Amino acid sequence: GSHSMRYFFTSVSRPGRGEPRFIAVGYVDDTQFVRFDSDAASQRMEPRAPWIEQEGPEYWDGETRKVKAHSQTHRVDLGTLRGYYNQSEAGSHTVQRMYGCDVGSDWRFLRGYHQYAYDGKDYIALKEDLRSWTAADMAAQTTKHKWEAAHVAEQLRAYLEGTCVEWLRRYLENGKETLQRTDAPKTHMTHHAVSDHEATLRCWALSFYPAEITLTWQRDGEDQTQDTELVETRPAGDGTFQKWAAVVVPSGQEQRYTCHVQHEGLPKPLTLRW
Template identity: 60%
Template structure:
């Protein structure tokens, strides 16, 4: 479970805008935006809409918590402007990201909390040592202040390792039909030729959930670690994910390469190779092309004959009509 928070100040705003977004794995499930007409913490997943029945008054409580966090962020923006010796008239952002992760057995695995200012890392919590790691010299002042009160780090650590995990388990149960499903990938291998003749094979996987997937290229059963190119796993926009991995090959050696796809939605790994179009397929395509050309020639001859016979080729009968279809220094993270 991850939360992203951000406060943004600019001369055009009466006060900094505060946004908070929560994710379970890679699925957004809650959000808060102080710029809305009636800002409140709101569900962003269908399974979260029944949360008020599970925990009466939860949306009101979390709205108040987010409003309080917004005020803390606004104060911290002013402090940071002083640390960086900046004008109050500029555009500035303060961001936070915090998360807890559990193992397949739902036991705590890791948690983190980190802040960024104006798009650059600022400070992060080391949950093992209860210390703060300053990413830039200006963050040393914040580090000293927060380490002077050990209870701040202890409170964050307790949240990440205990309370965050309890809510994560609850949400997994509430949204299990969505969050705990395993949609297998559909995959294929394509061949691409660059302008100078270089050949690349790409192994593409799509329509899978969750996002964790492995694409491995093998040459004669040996894993290829060089001449590889990957794109990070990306959301497809429909609740599933997509990814591809490419490998540079010598033309004529394509049959030596195989792509292995592993995903929890698959009963066993997929092994794929590039398959050039078969001779029979090419013959069929050629026959169809010849037939279409022949039909076009015959049609042209008929039209030419009608024109040369004075248009006496018979009466034109229109097709029957049909209707057209076109007419119609930071407080505890907010949490649900």
């Protein structure tokens, strides 16, 4: 199926003293593989997956140079945006940037993205055609005019359709033992009385990868959302994910209810029944 490479950058100004806190993370699909933290000792791009460690010193020197250049751009941007929004030097503000590329089922370029936010709100985003910009407000419109004149979209399109997908395919081959392995959810149901008359059925999906999953309840073969609870997909901490869905049922009618589990690692969806 489809694969993604994505970089996430966060820079938070420190008006009391010193430079912004800068944190950069790189992912292939739902696997973190590199990090940079301005607060950490190394001042280097650091590996976070075994398959990136085989990259040589040229790679790490290059990624360190680039991530430091990214940090300085975000430091300057915090100053520029304070100016555009007529904000005082006293308050802490945040810039976020995300970019990356998807390859499709055919292993070719599928899509690219480059999105920017100020104080957690959309600022400017590259449109899907990688040729035009979405500017949320008149500050972002100023940036759009600047980026059009400097042909930023052309520079990012070249990276997103080329370099980005070449390196994504490199990482996917080098890390294939994990990156190209699906971990199907380990599923089970629990039961406990909430009253003399009612019981909660909880459908568990554990130790799955990638994170994308659907848990649905049916009663007598028809979807039920009423009297259900679905928790946000959460990390196990070992690179896999967890999720559960629960339904409250009349005690003795548990056999009417089925939990349906959809995941890329399941050739057919699973059906669980108490």
